[PDB]
Design a binder for this molecule. Structure first.
Ligand SMILES: Nc1nc2c(ncn2[C@@H]2O[C@H](COP(=O)(O)OP(=O)(O)OP(=O)(O)O)[C@@H](O)[C@H]2O)c(=O)[nH]1
Ligand SMILES: Nc1nc2c(ncn2[C@@H]2O[C@H](COP(=O)(O)OP(=O)(O)OP(=O)(O)O)[C@@H](O)[C@H]2O)c(=O)[nH]1
Ligand SMILES: [Mg+2]
Ligand SMILES: [Mg+2]
Lengths: 106, 162, 106, 162
């Protein structure tokens, strides 16, 4: 509720060429027996969200898994941009979600 | 010392307002958080690492991926929003029952106390089913995020009880 | 309508160690700008299905793409076993289907 | 010579019965085809490379991936199935209008002629909307896949028309 300065950029994060990723892969995650596998470049892999890791990177990914109606594992990759803030902290905005599901033909 | 804080609550409870009031001493315009924020806030020689994760319903299933290593839970409640107070109770209890959140002390921000007819700290306590819980360390802190009232009182409580 | 000999095996088709694939990738197929990417081992890559290819391989994959309701590309990986027949031909039985879809967190 | 043939039609039309009757001279018990079958059948010194692709509704959107290089289209029809005959015309026209299937000549097996009150070859021609088509080379062949009737007459029509 002010003419206060914005906290961070909104549009997108492209400070620099190329892209470095925080790959946030929970301990609960198991590797599916799928042909589709995640392929992330210049990635820092972490099991726990970490500020130093976000500080170093431009992009953020969270691997999230649930059991779906038909007893099959459903893998979601939640992706977003990392922004630095006036406070010297970090913000992640989720941009899109990749869902990978399996099913038998019937 | 250093303390890791996870801050949850339904959408529009005022979590981001709190985070930036505490870090920037500014009442800033917020957008609903589709993602999460991190600020380190230093008060009374404690370095608080605060994770503010968006509360919109399609984000709550993701909350659990931020449980690990949390030393303090801050749960923020809109005290003017009676319709969704029970919903908040459900979410709160869903959080604190997780194995990963077993050791975390619990701070409630009964937020938006400035708003007309706001539910009081003691009413919040009853309606979040806190009164029955005894095996966990909890505290209801009245607060107004836009003015800053109660915020630092809340951080004091976490300091004392950790 | 008889006691005639079975055409082929039905249960499963892994007589040998390792696993060789027919990677049936149509001309119309385009590479998605996704994190999930297909990773097939010992794959023979074809744009057109082909009997000599099935002859050498134990597994079959077809990559199929449509436009989804939200106007997003949806990729489907149709996977199956290749069995040899009494007639000296081939049969492909679809086992499962991986589906990869995108969406904004809206 | 050699000829590449795609065999399509709704589920339970008799495609797999045809393919294996032609290749093994046996009336074998079939399972609904979730996938496809390939046999090479030699008749009148023609090497017919036949592709029997499943006809269950959720496999049909994949038919197009076997179009390329087809010289002969065999479309198989359950003539006793009056309910789904219009649906069958819709699939057939979807096939023959695709760019990859423009040069392929068309053979319709009006199958299950042995069955009580089956539609006759001319009625099939009508209800499949073939009568009008003058720019494509086509023929409706009465058949009974379980006895073998019509089958080799169909393969003969192909031989002549390439
Ligand atoms: N009157 C009043 N308004 C408040 C108070 N705290 C926050 N607000 C307002 O409440 C609205 C929502 O606040 P946010 O901080 O964005 O809530 P949030 O928890 O971050 O919501 P999500 O980002 O969806 O998780 C904003 O318009 C704030 O300015 C308060 O104490 N009193
Ligand atoms: N009465 C009669 N039954 C037939 C004839 N041809 C096939 N059938 C039977 O019809 C049923 C289905 O035959 P299929 O060859 O498996 O059908 P399909 O075209 O392969 O169908 P899908 O595999 O589901 O795509 C089986 O019971 C066959 O024995 C026929 O000419 N007359
Ligand atoms: Mg927020
Ligand atoms: Mg069949």
């Amino acid at each position: 509720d002010q003419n206060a300065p914005p906290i961070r950029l909104r549009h997108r994060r492209s400070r620099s060429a190329g892209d470095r990723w925080v790959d946030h892969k929970p301990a609960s995650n198991m590797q599916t027996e799928t042909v589709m596998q995640p392929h992330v470049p210049h990635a820092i892999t972490v099991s726990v969200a970490n500020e130093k890791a976000l500080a170093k990177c431009e992009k953020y990914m969270l691997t999230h898994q649930e059991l779906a109606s038909d007893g099959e594992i459903e893998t979601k990759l939640i992706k977003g941009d990392i922004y630095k803030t006036r406070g010297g902290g970090q913000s992640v905005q989720f941009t899109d979600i990749e869902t990978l599901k399996q099913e038998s033909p019937n | 010392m250093e303390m890791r804080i996870l801050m949850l609550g339904l959408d529009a409870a005022g979590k981001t307002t709190i985070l930036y009031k505490l870090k920037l001493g500014q009442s800033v315009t917020t957008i609903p958080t589709v993602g999460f924020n991190v600020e380190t806030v230093t008060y009374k020689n404690v370095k608080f690492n605060v994770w503010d994760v968006g509360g919109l319903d399609k984000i709550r299933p993701l909350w659990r991926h931020y449980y690990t290593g949390t030393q303090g839970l801050i749960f923020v409640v809109d005290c003017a929003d009676r319709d969704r107070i029970d919903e908040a109770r459900q979410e709160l209890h869903r959080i604190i029952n997780d194995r990963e959140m077993r050791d975390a002390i619990i701070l409630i921000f009964a937020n938006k106390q400035d708003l007309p007819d706001a539910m009081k700290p003691h009413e919040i306590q009853e309606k979040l089913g806190l009164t029955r819980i005894r095996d966990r360390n909890w505290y209801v802190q009245p607060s107004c995020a836009t003015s800053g009232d109660g915020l630092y009182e809340g951080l004091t409580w976490l300091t004392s009880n950790y």
